[PDB]
Protein backbone atom coordinates (compact mmCIF):
# COMPACT_ATOMS: atom_id res chain seq x y z
CA UNK A 1 0.00 0.00 0.00
CA UNK A 2 1.10 3.53 -0.83
CA UNK A 3 2.34 5.56 2.15
CA UNK A 4 3.53 9.15 1.82
CA UNK A 5 5.78 10.88 4.31
CA UNK A 6 3.53 13.95 4.42
CA UNK A 7 0.76 11.71 5.80
CA UNK A 8 3.01 10.38 8.57
CA UNK A 9 4.16 13.94 9.28
CA UNK A 10 0.58 15.23 9.44
CA UNK A 11 -0.40 12.65 12.06
CA UNK A 12 2.76 13.11 14.13
CA UNK A 13 2.63 16.92 13.97
CA UNK A 14 -0.91 16.77 15.36
CA UNK A 15 0.43 15.29 18.61
CA UNK A 16 1.62 18.76 19.63
CA UNK A 17 -1.79 20.28 18.80
CA UNK A 18 -4.09 17.92 20.71
CA UNK A 19 -6.46 19.21 23.40
CA UNK A 20 -5.75 16.73 26.19
CA UNK A 21 -5.61 18.69 29.46
CA UNK A 22 -6.93 15.70 31.42
CA UNK A 23 -5.08 12.66 30.04
CA UNK A 24 -2.00 14.39 28.60
CA UNK A 25 -2.27 11.51 26.11
CA UNK A 26 -2.23 13.08 22.59
CA UNK A 27 -3.35 11.25 19.47
CA UNK A 28 -3.02 12.55 15.92
CA UNK A 29 -4.57 11.55 12.62
CA UNK A 30 -4.18 12.13 8.90
CA UNK A 31 -7.17 11.25 6.71
CA UNK A 32 -6.49 11.20 2.95
CA UNK A 33 -9.09 11.65 0.20
CA UNK A 34 -9.02 10.25 -3.34
CA UNK A 35 -8.01 13.69 -4.64
CA UNK A 36 -4.99 13.70 -2.31
CA UNK A 37 -6.45 16.32 0.05
CA UNK A 38 -5.32 15.76 3.67
CA UNK A 39 -7.41 16.25 6.83
CA UNK A 40 -5.63 16.42 10.18
CA UNK A 41 -7.28 15.26 13.40
CA UNK A 42 -6.55 15.62 17.11
CA UNK A 43 -8.23 14.17 20.17
CA UNK A 44 -10.23 16.81 22.07
CA UNK A 45 -11.17 16.08 25.67
CA UNK A 46 -13.97 17.42 27.86
CA UNK A 47 -14.20 17.86 31.64
CA UNK A 48 -16.98 15.26 31.31
CA UNK A 49 -14.75 12.53 29.87
CA UNK A 50 -17.56 10.88 27.91
CA UNK A 51 -17.79 13.88 25.61
CA UNK A 52 -14.16 13.46 24.52
CA UNK A 53 -13.64 13.13 20.75
CA UNK A 54 -10.83 11.07 19.20
CA UNK A 55 -8.34 12.25 16.59
CA UNK A 56 -9.62 9.81 13.96
CA UNK A 57 -13.20 11.00 14.37
CA UNK A 58 -12.10 14.65 14.36
CA UNK A 59 -10.46 14.07 10.97
CA UNK A 60 -13.56 12.33 9.59
CA UNK A 61 -15.88 15.05 10.90
CA UNK A 62 -13.68 17.73 9.32
CA UNK A 63 -13.56 15.95 5.95
CA UNK A 64 -17.22 14.98 5.92
CA UNK A 65 -18.24 18.55 6.77
CA UNK A 66 -16.41 19.71 3.62
CA UNK A 67 -18.34 17.22 1.48
CA UNK A 68 -15.61 14.57 1.23
CA UNK A 69 -16.89 11.03 0.71
CA UNK A 70 -13.97 9.14 -0.92
CA UNK A 71 -11.17 8.16 1.47
CA UNK A 72 -8.01 6.28 0.53
CA UNK A 73 -5.86 6.18 3.66
CA UNK A 74 -5.84 6.87 7.39
CA UNK A 75 -2.70 7.36 9.50
CA UNK A 76 -3.07 7.39 13.29
CA UNK A 77 -0.16 8.33 15.57
CA UNK A 78 0.56 8.26 19.30
CA UNK A 79 3.41 8.71 21.78
CA UNK A 80 3.36 4.97 22.41
CA UNK A 81 6.03 2.23 22.34
CA UNK A 82 3.95 0.16 19.93
CA UNK A 83 1.79 1.61 17.13
CA UNK A 84 -1.27 3.42 18.48
CA UNK A 85 -4.51 1.41 18.53
CA UNK A 86 -7.72 3.12 17.34
CA UNK A 87 -10.55 2.69 19.81
CA UNK A 88 -13.70 0.80 18.83
CA UNK A 89 -15.79 3.95 18.49
CA UNK A 90 -13.40 5.28 15.88
CA UNK A 91 -13.34 1.95 14.07
CA UNK A 92 -17.14 2.20 13.72
CA UNK A 93 -16.93 5.70 12.25
CA UNK A 94 -14.28 4.49 9.80
CA UNK A 95 -16.65 1.71 8.74
CA UNK A 96 -19.39 4.28 8.08
CA UNK A 97 -17.26 6.15 5.56
CA UNK A 98 -14.55 3.81 4.25
CA UNK A 99 -14.25 0.71 2.15
CA UNK A 100 -13.51 -2.46 4.15
CA UNK A 101 -10.12 -2.75 2.45
CA UNK A 102 -9.09 0.89 2.82
CA UNK A 103 -5.54 0.95 4.25
CA UNK A 104 -4.78 2.20 7.76
CA UNK A 105 -1.28 2.96 9.08
CA UNK A 106 -0.70 3.03 12.84
CA UNK A 107 2.34 4.86 14.21
CA UNK A 108 4.08 4.98 17.58
CA UNK A 109 7.26 6.52 18.95
CA UNK A 110 10.67 5.97 17.35
CA UNK A 111 9.15 5.13 13.96
CA UNK A 112 7.26 1.93 14.81
CA UNK A 113 4.37 1.32 12.43
CA UNK A 114 1.64 -1.22 11.75
CA UNK A 115 -0.19 -1.66 8.45
CA UNK A 116 -3.82 -2.78 8.58
CA UNK A 117 -7.25 -2.05 7.07
CA UNK A 118 -10.73 -1.01 8.12
CA UNK A 119 -12.02 -4.58 7.83
CA UNK A 120 -9.17 -6.05 9.89
CA UNK A 121 -9.75 -3.52 12.68
CA UNK A 122 -13.55 -4.07 12.72
CA UNK A 123 -14.47 -7.54 11.45
CA UNK A 124 -18.12 -8.43 10.91
CA UNK A 125 -18.86 -4.70 11.02
CA UNK A 126 -22.32 -3.44 11.91
CA UNK A 127 -23.99 -1.53 9.04
CA UNK A 128 -27.31 0.18 8.28
CA UNK A 129 -28.58 -2.83 6.26
CA UNK A 130 -31.46 -3.82 8.54
CA UNK A 131 -32.66 -0.45 9.89
CA UNK B 1 -18.01 -23.02 24.48
CA UNK B 2 -20.86 -23.45 26.94
CA UNK B 3 -24.16 -21.85 25.86
CA UNK B 4 -27.29 -22.00 27.99
CA UNK B 5 -30.79 -21.52 26.66
CA UNK B 6 -31.66 -19.06 29.45
CA UNK B 7 -28.93 -16.76 28.11
CA UNK B 8 -30.36 -16.87 24.58
CA UNK B 9 -33.84 -16.32 26.03
CA UNK B 10 -32.67 -13.35 28.10
CA UNK B 11 -31.22 -11.59 25.06
CA UNK B 12 -34.21 -12.35 22.82
CA UNK B 13 -36.78 -11.39 25.48
CA UNK B 14 -35.07 -8.01 25.79
CA UNK B 15 -36.03 -7.19 22.18
CA UNK B 16 -39.58 -6.48 23.36
CA UNK B 17 -38.30 -4.23 26.17
CA UNK B 18 -35.96 -1.94 24.22
CA UNK B 19 -36.46 1.84 24.19
CA UNK B 20 -36.16 2.54 20.47
CA UNK B 21 -38.86 5.09 19.56
CA UNK B 22 -36.67 6.56 16.80
CA UNK B 23 -35.11 3.57 15.02
CA UNK B 24 -37.65 0.87 15.96
CA UNK B 25 -34.52 -1.31 15.79
CA UNK B 26 -34.35 -3.25 19.12
CA UNK B 27 -31.22 -4.97 20.38
CA UNK B 28 -31.02 -7.21 23.44
CA UNK B 29 -28.15 -8.53 25.51
CA UNK B 30 -27.41 -11.12 28.18
CA UNK B 31 -24.19 -10.66 30.15
CA UNK B 32 -23.16 -13.63 32.33
CA UNK B 33 -20.90 -13.48 35.40
CA UNK B 34 -18.63 -16.21 36.77
CA UNK B 35 -21.19 -16.91 39.51
CA UNK B 36 -23.88 -17.51 36.87
CA UNK B 37 -25.73 -14.26 37.58
CA UNK B 38 -27.36 -12.83 34.42
CA UNK B 39 -27.63 -9.14 33.45
CA UNK B 40 -30.07 -8.15 30.70
CA UNK B 41 -29.45 -5.16 28.45
CA UNK B 42 -31.52 -3.14 25.98
CA UNK B 43 -30.63 -0.31 23.65
CA UNK B 44 -32.00 3.03 24.88
CA UNK B 45 -32.26 5.88 22.39
CA UNK B 46 -32.35 9.64 22.88
CA UNK B 47 -33.93 12.40 20.77
CA UNK B 48 -30.29 13.49 20.32
CA UNK B 49 -29.16 10.28 18.64
CA UNK B 50 -25.58 10.56 19.87
CA UNK B 51 -26.71 9.97 23.45
CA UNK B 52 -28.18 6.57 22.54
CA UNK B 53 -26.86 3.64 24.60
CA UNK B 54 -26.50 0.11 23.21
CA UNK B 55 -27.87 -3.07 24.77
CA UNK B 56 -24.39 -4.52 25.36
CA UNK B 57 -23.24 -1.41 27.21
CA UNK B 58 -26.49 -1.27 29.20
CA UNK B 59 -25.80 -4.81 30.44
CA UNK B 60 -22.20 -3.96 31.35
CA UNK B 61 -23.22 -0.76 33.14
CA UNK B 62 -25.84 -2.68 35.12
CA UNK B 63 -23.41 -5.43 36.11
CA UNK B 64 -20.51 -3.11 36.86
CA UNK B 65 -22.75 -0.92 39.03
CA UNK B 66 -23.50 -3.99 41.18
CA UNK B 67 -19.78 -4.65 41.66
CA UNK B 68 -19.44 -7.43 39.07
CA UNK B 69 -15.98 -7.77 37.55
CA UNK B 70 -15.78 -11.39 36.29
CA UNK B 71 -17.65 -12.05 33.04
CA UNK B 72 -17.86 -15.39 31.24
CA UNK B 73 -20.24 -14.88 28.32
CA UNK B 74 -22.13 -12.27 26.33
CA UNK B 75 -25.14 -12.98 24.10
CA UNK B 76 -26.36 -10.22 21.78
CA UNK B 77 -29.61 -10.55 19.82
CA UNK B 78 -31.38 -8.62 17.06
CA UNK B 79 -34.33 -8.90 14.68
CA UNK B 80 -31.88 -9.39 11.82
CA UNK B 81 -31.51 -12.03 9.07
CA UNK B 82 -27.90 -12.67 10.06
CA UNK B 83 -26.59 -12.62 13.65
CA UNK B 84 -26.55 -9.09 15.09
CA UNK B 85 -23.19 -7.28 14.95
CA UNK B 86 -22.04 -5.34 18.05
CA UNK B 87 -20.96 -1.83 17.19
CA UNK B 88 -17.37 -0.72 17.77
CA UNK B 89 -18.22 1.35 20.84
CA UNK B 90 -19.63 -1.73 22.53
CA UNK B 91 -16.63 -3.81 21.51
CA UNK B 92 -14.40 -1.29 23.31
CA UNK B 93 -16.46 -1.51 26.50
CA UNK B 94 -16.28 -5.31 26.32
CA UNK B 95 -12.49 -5.03 26.07
CA UNK B 96 -12.43 -2.86 29.21
CA UNK B 97 -14.09 -5.56 31.30
CA UNK B 98 -13.57 -8.94 29.61
CA UNK B 99 -10.77 -11.32 28.84
CA UNK B 100 -9.71 -11.34 25.17
CA UNK B 101 -10.90 -14.93 24.83
CA UNK B 102 -14.24 -14.49 26.60
CA UNK B 103 -16.95 -16.06 24.38
CA UNK B 104 -19.59 -13.97 22.63
CA UNK B 105 -22.72 -15.38 20.96
CA UNK B 106 -24.51 -13.30 18.32
CA UNK B 107 -28.14 -14.10 17.50
CA UNK B 108 -30.52 -13.09 14.73
CA UNK B 109 -34.03 -14.05 13.66
CA UNK B 110 -35.09 -17.65 13.07
CA UNK B 111 -32.32 -19.02 15.31
CA UNK B 112 -29.24 -17.94 13.35
CA UNK B 113 -26.18 -17.61 15.59
CA UNK B 114 -22.50 -16.77 15.37
CA UNK B 115 -19.86 -17.75 17.93
CA UNK B 116 -16.94 -15.38 18.46
CA UNK B 117 -14.84 -13.75 21.20
CA UNK B 118 -13.88 -10.32 22.49
CA UNK B 119 -10.47 -10.51 20.81
CA UNK B 120 -11.91 -11.55 17.43
CA UNK B 121 -14.39 -8.66 17.49
CA UNK B 122 -11.74 -6.08 18.51
CA UNK B 123 -8.25 -7.15 17.40
CA UNK B 124 -5.23 -5.14 18.52
CA UNK B 125 -7.47 -3.60 21.18
CA UNK B 126 -6.62 -0.23 22.72
CA UNK B 127 -5.92 -0.45 26.47
CA UNK B 128 -4.86 1.84 29.33
CA UNK B 129 -1.21 0.64 29.15
CA UNK B 130 0.38 3.93 28.06
CA UNK B 131 -1.79 6.53 29.85
CA UNK C 1 -41.70 13.00 55.17
CA UNK C 2 -40.41 14.13 51.79
CA UNK C 3 -37.34 15.63 53.48
CA UNK C 4 -36.66 12.37 55.34
CA UNK C 5 -36.96 10.27 52.17
CA UNK C 6 -34.65 12.72 50.40
CA UNK C 7 -32.00 12.14 53.09
CA UNK C 8 -32.12 8.41 52.37
CA UNK C 9 -31.82 9.03 48.62
CA UNK C 10 -28.86 11.32 49.36
CA UNK C 11 -27.30 8.49 51.38
CA UNK C 12 -27.74 6.10 48.45
CA UNK C 13 -26.07 8.53 46.07
CA UNK C 14 -23.20 9.09 48.50
CA UNK C 15 -22.67 5.34 49.00
CA UNK C 16 -22.38 5.04 45.22
CA UNK C 17 -19.20 7.15 45.37
CA UNK C 18 -17.43 4.12 46.84
CA UNK C 19 -18.71 1.91 43.99
CA UNK C 20 -17.63 4.04 41.01
CA UNK C 21 -15.32 2.70 38.27
CA UNK C 22 -13.02 5.68 37.77
CA UNK C 23 -9.46 4.31 37.38
CA UNK C 24 -8.55 7.21 35.05
CA UNK C 25 -10.01 10.38 36.57
CA UNK C 26 -10.27 9.15 40.17
CA UNK C 27 -13.31 11.45 40.32
CA UNK C 28 -16.33 9.41 41.48
CA UNK C 29 -19.93 10.45 40.99
CA UNK C 30 -22.96 8.76 42.51
CA UNK C 31 -26.65 8.89 41.67
CA UNK C 32 -29.98 7.81 43.14
CA UNK C 33 -32.90 7.79 40.68
CA UNK C 34 -36.33 7.40 42.29
CA UNK C 35 -39.45 5.99 40.64
CA UNK C 36 -43.15 6.72 41.20
CA UNK C 37 -43.46 3.25 42.77
CA UNK C 38 -40.81 4.02 45.38
CA UNK C 39 -38.11 1.89 43.80
CA UNK C 40 -34.63 3.40 43.63
CA UNK C 41 -31.87 2.80 41.10
CA UNK C 42 -28.29 3.57 42.05
CA UNK C 43 -25.87 4.88 39.44
CA UNK C 44 -22.07 5.18 39.23
CA UNK C 45 -19.79 6.68 36.64
CA UNK C 46 -17.99 4.00 34.61
CA UNK C 47 -14.89 5.08 32.70
CA UNK C 48 -13.16 3.57 29.67
CA UNK C 49 -9.52 3.65 28.58
CA UNK C 50 -10.91 5.58 25.60
CA UNK C 51 -12.35 8.49 27.59
CA UNK C 52 -15.18 9.14 25.15
CA UNK C 53 -16.84 5.83 26.08
CA UNK C 54 -17.15 6.84 29.75
CA UNK C 55 -20.70 6.73 31.15
CA UNK C 56 -21.89 9.07 33.91
CA UNK C 57 -23.58 8.03 37.13
CA UNK C 58 -26.87 9.71 36.22
CA UNK C 59 -27.05 7.90 32.90
CA UNK C 60 -26.07 4.59 34.51
CA UNK C 61 -29.08 5.02 36.83
CA UNK C 62 -31.45 5.84 33.97
CA UNK C 63 -30.20 2.94 31.86
CA UNK C 64 -30.68 0.55 34.79
CA UNK C 65 -34.19 1.85 35.44
CA UNK C 66 -35.33 2.06 31.84
CA UNK C 67 -34.06 -1.49 31.18
CA UNK C 68 -36.43 -2.71 33.92
CA UNK C 69 -39.37 -0.94 32.27
CA UNK C 70 -39.42 2.21 34.41
CA UNK C 71 -40.85 5.29 32.71
CA UNK C 72 -42.17 7.33 35.69
CA UNK C 73 -39.52 9.13 37.74
CA UNK C 74 -40.08 11.38 40.73
CA UNK C 75 -36.64 12.51 41.96
CA UNK C 76 -32.96 12.34 41.06
CA UNK C 77 -30.04 12.79 43.48
CA UNK C 78 -26.46 13.27 42.23
CA UNK C 79 -23.46 13.33 44.58
CA UNK C 80 -19.76 14.09 44.27
CA UNK C 81 -16.72 14.63 46.48
CA UNK C 82 -16.91 18.32 45.66
CA UNK C 83 -16.84 21.44 47.87
CA UNK C 84 -20.04 22.70 46.23
CA UNK C 85 -22.93 20.45 45.13
CA UNK C 86 -21.90 18.42 42.09
CA UNK C 87 -23.11 19.61 38.65
CA UNK C 88 -24.59 17.09 36.19
CA UNK C 89 -22.96 17.37 32.78
CA UNK C 90 -24.98 18.41 29.75
CA UNK C 91 -25.17 14.88 28.35
CA UNK C 92 -26.83 13.63 31.53
CA UNK C 93 -29.20 16.59 31.52
CA UNK C 94 -30.35 15.55 28.04
CA UNK C 95 -31.07 12.00 29.17
CA UNK C 96 -33.00 13.42 32.12
CA UNK C 97 -35.08 15.46 29.68
CA UNK C 98 -35.83 12.31 27.64
CA UNK C 99 -37.41 10.50 30.58
CA UNK C 100 -38.48 13.09 33.18
CA UNK C 101 -41.05 15.82 33.51
CA UNK C 102 -39.59 19.34 33.28
CA UNK C 103 -40.57 20.06 36.90
CA UNK C 104 -39.03 16.84 38.29
CA UNK C 105 -36.89 17.82 41.31
CA UNK C 106 -33.16 17.11 41.23
CA UNK C 107 -31.02 17.26 44.39
CA UNK C 108 -27.31 17.93 43.98
CA UNK C 109 -24.93 16.93 46.78
CA UNK C 110 -21.33 17.76 47.64
CA UNK C 111 -19.01 17.08 50.55
CA UNK C 112 -19.88 18.00 54.16
CA UNK C 113 -23.62 17.89 53.52
CA UNK C 114 -23.89 20.75 51.00
CA UNK C 115 -26.96 20.46 48.77
CA UNK C 116 -28.64 22.36 45.96
CA UNK C 117 -32.28 21.97 44.93
CA UNK C 118 -33.11 22.29 41.25
CA UNK C 119 -35.28 20.69 38.53
CA UNK C 120 -34.84 19.13 35.09
CA UNK C 121 -36.09 22.31 33.40
CA UNK C 122 -33.76 24.52 35.44
CA UNK C 123 -30.73 22.40 34.48
CA UNK C 124 -31.66 22.24 30.76
CA UNK C 125 -33.71 25.28 29.72
CA UNK C 126 -35.40 25.25 26.31
CA UNK C 127 -34.69 21.52 26.11
CA UNK C 128 -34.45 19.71 22.79
CA UNK C 129 -37.19 17.08 22.42
CA UNK C 130 -38.46 14.61 19.84
CA UNK C 131 -41.23 16.98 18.66
CA UNK C 132 -39.74 17.83 15.25
CA UNK C 133 -38.25 14.47 14.26
CA UNK D 1 -22.75 46.14 12.39
CA UNK D 2 -23.07 43.29 14.87
CA UNK D 3 -26.60 42.60 13.61
CA UNK D 4 -25.38 42.52 9.99
CA UNK D 5 -22.54 40.11 10.80
CA UNK D 6 -25.00 37.93 12.70
CA UNK D 7 -27.18 37.68 9.58
CA UNK D 8 -24.19 36.35 7.64
CA UNK D 9 -23.42 33.81 10.40
CA UNK D 10 -27.09 32.79 10.32
CA UNK D 11 -26.77 32.29 6.56
CA UNK D 12 -23.72 30.06 7.06
CA UNK D 13 -25.56 27.94 9.61
CA UNK D 14 -28.58 27.64 7.31
CA UNK D 15 -26.43 26.64 4.32
CA UNK D 16 -24.98 23.87 6.49
CA UNK D 17 -28.44 22.26 6.60
CA UNK D 18 -27.89 21.20 2.99
CA UNK D 19 -24.51 19.67 3.88
CA UNK D 20 -25.56 17.48 6.82
CA UNK D 21 -24.97 13.70 6.89
CA UNK D 22 -28.27 12.50 8.31
CA UNK D 23 -29.30 9.37 6.34
CA UNK D 24 -31.03 7.93 9.44
CA UNK D 25 -32.96 10.77 11.07
CA UNK D 26 -33.28 13.02 8.00
CA UNK D 27 -33.14 15.85 10.55
CA UNK D 28 -30.32 18.23 9.57
CA UNK D 29 -28.72 20.73 11.91
CA UNK D 30 -26.27 23.45 10.93
CA UNK D 31 -23.83 25.54 12.94
CA UNK D 32 -21.62 28.60 12.50
CA UNK D 33 -18.94 29.05 15.18
CA UNK D 34 -17.21 32.44 15.15
CA UNK D 35 -13.72 33.21 16.46
CA UNK D 36 -12.23 36.38 17.95
CA UNK D 37 -10.18 36.75 14.75
CA UNK D 38 -13.28 36.79 12.57
CA UNK D 39 -12.79 33.29 11.20
CA UNK D 40 -15.89 31.10 11.00
CA UNK D 41 -16.17 27.32 11.25
CA UNK D 42 -19.23 25.60 9.80
CA UNK D 43 -20.63 22.50 11.48
CA UNK D 44 -23.04 19.75 10.39
CA UNK D 45 -24.51 16.81 12.23
CA UNK D 46 -22.94 13.52 11.13
CA UNK D 47 -24.85 10.34 11.93
CA UNK D 48 -23.69 6.73 12.28
CA UNK D 49 -25.52 3.46 11.70
CA UNK D 50 -24.94 2.98 15.44
CA UNK D 51 -26.89 6.04 16.58
CA UNK D 52 -24.75 6.61 19.66
CA UNK D 53 -21.75 7.56 17.49
CA UNK D 54 -23.65 10.45 15.87
CA UNK D 55 -21.96 13.86 16.19
CA UNK D 56 -23.92 17.11 16.37
CA UNK D 57 -23.38 20.17 14.20
CA UNK D 58 -22.26 22.33 17.13
CA UNK D 59 -19.63 19.81 18.18
CA UNK D 60 -18.47 19.33 14.59
CA UNK D 61 -17.84 23.10 14.47
CA UNK D 62 -15.94 23.11 17.76
CA UNK D 63 -13.84 20.10 16.77
CA UNK D 64 -12.95 21.75 13.45
CA UNK D 65 -12.01 25.01 15.19
CA UNK D 66 -10.13 23.50 18.12
CA UNK D 67 -8.14 21.26 15.74
CA UNK D 68 -6.87 24.43 14.02
CA UNK D 69 -5.75 25.88 17.36
CA UNK D 70 -8.75 28.12 18.04
CA UNK D 71 -9.45 28.80 21.72
CA UNK D 72 -11.21 32.22 21.59
CA UNK D 73 -14.83 32.14 20.46
CA UNK D 74 -17.20 35.09 20.19
CA UNK D 75 -20.52 33.75 18.84
CA UNK D 76 -22.28 30.50 17.95
CA UNK D 77 -25.24 30.13 15.57
CA UNK D 78 -27.26 26.89 15.38
CA UNK D 79 -29.98 26.33 12.77
CA UNK D 80 -32.62 23.70 12.09
CA UNK D 81 -35.64 23.13 9.86
CA UNK D 82 -37.84 23.67 12.90
CA UNK D 83 -40.92 25.86 13.48
CA UNK D 84 -39.29 27.37 16.58
CA UNK D 85 -35.55 28.12 16.89
CA UNK D 86 -33.59 24.88 17.17
CA UNK D 87 -32.43 23.78 20.65
CA UNK D 88 -28.84 22.56 21.15
CA UNK D 89 -28.75 19.24 22.97
CA UNK D 90 -27.16 18.95 26.39
CA UNK D 91 -24.02 17.26 25.05
CA UNK D 92 -23.32 20.21 22.77
CA UNK D 93 -24.00 22.64 25.59
CA UNK D 94 -21.28 20.90 27.62
CA UNK D 95 -18.74 21.25 24.81
CA UNK D 96 -19.70 24.92 24.53
CA UNK D 97 -18.98 25.31 28.24
CA UNK D 98 -15.54 23.70 27.79
CA UNK D 99 -14.41 26.29 25.26
CA UNK D 100 -16.56 29.42 25.66
CA UNK D 101 -17.08 32.15 28.19
CA UNK D 102 -20.37 31.86 30.11
CA UNK D 103 -21.64 35.11 28.58
CA UNK D 104 -20.80 34.12 24.98
CA UNK D 105 -23.89 34.84 22.86
CA UNK D 106 -25.60 31.97 21.05
CA UNK D 107 -28.16 32.57 18.29
CA UNK D 108 -30.71 29.83 17.61
CA UNK D 109 -32.47 29.73 14.24
CA UNK D 110 -35.53 27.96 12.88
CA UNK D 111 -37.52 28.06 9.66
CA UNK D 112 -38.99 31.28 8.23
CA UNK D 113 -36.44 33.48 9.97
CA UNK D 114 -37.36 32.74 13.59
CA UNK D 115 -34.50 33.38 16.01
CA UNK D 116 -33.79 33.21 19.73
CA UNK D 117 -30.95 35.01 21.49
CA UNK D 118 -29.31 33.26 24.42
CA UNK D 119 -25.86 32.60 25.96
CA UNK D 120 -23.74 29.63 27.03
CA UNK D 121 -24.62 30.22 30.69
CA UNK D 122 -28.34 30.47 29.94
CA UNK D 123 -28.29 27.15 28.05
CA UNK D 124 -26.24 25.32 30.73
CA UNK D 125 -26.78 26.86 34.17
CA UNK D 126 -24.48 25.81 37.01
CA UNK D 127 -22.19 24.23 34.43
CA UNK D 128 -19.81 21.41 35.32
CA UNK D 129 -16.17 22.45 34.85
CA UNK D 130 -12.70 21.02 35.39
CA UNK D 131 -12.28 22.81 38.75
CA UNK D 132 -12.51 19.73 40.99
CA UNK D 133 -10.65 17.17 38.88
ZN1 LIG E 1 -11.18 6.63 19.19
ZN1 LIG F 1 -23.15 -0.78 20.42
ZN1 LIG G 1 -22.90 13.32 32.93
ZN1 LIG H 1 -25.97 18.27 20.18
Give me the sign of the Cα torsion angle C125, C130, C132, D4.
positive
Instruction: Collapse the DSSP code of D107 into the 3-class scheme (helix H, G, I; strand E, B; otherwise coil) and give the result.
Output: strand
Instruction: Collapse the DSSP code of B119 into the 3-class scheme (helix H, G, I; strand E, B; otherwise coil) and give the result.
Output: helix
Nearest to D45 by CA among D80, D8, D2: D80
- Among A85, A97, A131, the strongest candidate for a mutation testing the B interface, having the largest count of B CBs within 10 A, is A85
Instruction: Collapse the DSSP code of D110 into the 3-class scheme (helix H, G, I; strand E, B; otherwise coil) and give the result.
Output: coil
Find residue D76's DSSP bridge partners. D33, D106
Backbone angles phi, psi at C46, to 5 degrees: -135, 105
Q: How many CA atoms lie within 13 A of C100 on its CB side?
A: 31
DSSP string, C54-117: -B-HHHHHHHHHHHTT---EEEEEEEES-SSPPPPPHHHHHHHHHHS-TT-EEEEE-GGG-EEE
For residue D116, the tally of other CB atoms under 10 A from its CB is 15
A42-A46-A51-A56 Cα dihedral, nearest 10 degrees:
10
Backbone angles phi, psi at D46, to 5 degrees: -135, 105
CATH, range B5-120: 3.40.140.10
Q: How many CA atoms lie within 13 A of B56 on its CB side?
A: 30
Nearest to C127 by CA among D28, D25, B48, D105: B48
Q: What is the rounded distance in angstroms from the CA atom of residue B14 to the CA atom of residue B31?
A: 12
Nearest to D108 by CA among D4, D26, D25, D30: D30
CA R_g for chain C = 14
Q: What is the rounded distance in angstroms from the CA atom of residue D47 to the CA atom of residue D52?
A: 9
Q: Which residue of B has its CA nearest to D29?
A: B48
Which run of H or of E encompasses A100?
A: none
C132 touches D at CB < 8 Å? yes
Instruction: Collapse the DSSP code of A114 into the 3-class scheme (helix H, G, I; strand E, B; otherwise coil) and give the result.
Output: strand
How many Å from the N-terminal Cα to the C-terminal Cα in chain A? 34
DSSP string, D26-71: ---EEEEEEETTS-EEEEE-B--SSGGG-B-HHHHHHHHHHHTT--
Q: What is the DSSP letter of A12?
A: H
Instruction: Collapse the DSSP code of D91 into the 3-class scheme (helix H, G, I; strand E, B; otherwise coil) and give the result.
Output: helix
Q: What is the rounded distance in angstroms from the CA atom of residue C61 to the CA atom of residue C93?
A: 13
Q: What is the rounded distance in angstroms from the CA atom of residue D31 to the CA atom of residue D16?
A: 7
Please judge whether C125 and D122 are an interchain contact, meaning their C-beta atoms are less than 8 angstroms apart.
yes
B109-B112-B118-B122 Cα dihedral, nearest 10 degrees:
-80
Strands (E), chain B: 27-33, 38-42, 71-78, 103-107, 113-117
Domain ranges of chain B: 5-120
Nearest to B93 by CA among C8, C58, C50, D109: C50
Contact B12, B77 (CB under 8 A): yes
Instruction: Collapse the DSSP code of A6 into the 3-class scheme (helix H, G, I; strand E, B; otherwise coil) and give the result.
Output: helix
Q: What is the DSSP letter of C52?
A: G
Instruction: Collapse the DSSP code of D98 into the 3-class scheme (helix H, G, I; strand E, B; otherwise coil) and give the result.
Output: helix
Nearest to A87 by CA among B98, B127, B55: B127
Q: Which CATH architecture has domain D2-121?
A: 3-Layer(aba) Sandwich (3.40)
Q: What is the rounded distance in angstroms from the CA atom of residue A45 to the CA atom of residue D59?
A: 12
B21: chain C residues, CB-CB within 8 Å: 130
Contact D34, D42 (CB under 8 A): no
User: A58-69 burial string, b = 16+ CB within 10 Å, else e?
Assistant: bbbbbbbbeebe
For residue B4, the tally of other CB atoms under 10 A from its CB is 14
Question: Cα B6–B12–B18 angle (5° rounding)?
Answer: 130
How many Å from the N-terminal Cα to the C-terminal Cα in chain C? 41
Name residues with Cβ closer than 5 Å to ligand 2, which is an ion.
B 54, 87, 90
Q: What is the rounded distance in angstroms from the CA atom of residue C124 to the CA atom of residue C117?
A: 14
Q: What is the rounded distance in angstroms from the CA atom of residue A35 to the CA atom of residue A42?
A: 22
D103-D109-D114-D116 Cα dihedral, nearest 10 degrees:
-20
Contact A19, A45 (CB under 8 A): yes
Question: Cα D112–D117–D119 angle (5° rounding)?
Answer: 145
**Domain A5-115: CATH superfamily, name plus number:** Cytidine Deaminase, domain 2 (3.40.140.10)
Which other chains touch chain D, taking contact as 3+ CB pairs less than 8 Å apart?
A: A, B, C
For residue D81, the tally of other CB atoms under 10 A from its CB is 16
Contact B65, B32 (CB under 8 A): no
Strand order in the sheet with D29-35: D40-44, D29-35, D73-80, D105-109, D115-119
Contact C128, C102 (CB under 8 A): no
DSSP string, A22-86: TT---EEEEEEETT--EEEEE-B--SSGGG-B-HHHHHHHHHHHTT---EEEEEEEESSSSPPPP
Catalytic residue among D15, D58, D68, D98: D58
Q: Which CATH number applies to C2-122: 3.40.140.10, 3.30.530.50, 3.30.470.10, 2.40.10.120?
A: 3.40.140.10
Backbone angles phi, psi at D40, to 5 degrees: -115, 150
- Of all ligands present, the nearest one to the C-alpha of A93 is 1
Please judge whether A89 and C55 are an interchain contact, meaning their C-beta atoms are less than 8 angstroms apart.
no
For residue D124, the tally of other CB atoms under 10 A from its CB is 26
Amino acid sequence: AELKQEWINTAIEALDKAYVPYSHFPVGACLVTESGKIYQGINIENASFGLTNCAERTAFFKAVSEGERSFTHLVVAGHTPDPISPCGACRQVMAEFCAPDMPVTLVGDNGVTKATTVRELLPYAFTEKDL
